[PDB]
């Protein structure tokens, strides 16, 4: 399975 992974980094902590 080909999927585009991108991490969600939180800005307030």
DSSP 1-13: ----------S--
Residues in the chain, total: 13
How many angstroms from the chain centroid is the CA of residue 2?
A: 16
Distance CA 11, CA 13 (A): 6
User: Cα–Cα distances in Å, from 1 out to 6, 7, 8?
Assistant: 16, 18, 21
């Amino acid at each position: 399975q080909l999927y585009e992974n991108k991490p969600r980094r939180p800005y307030i902590l």
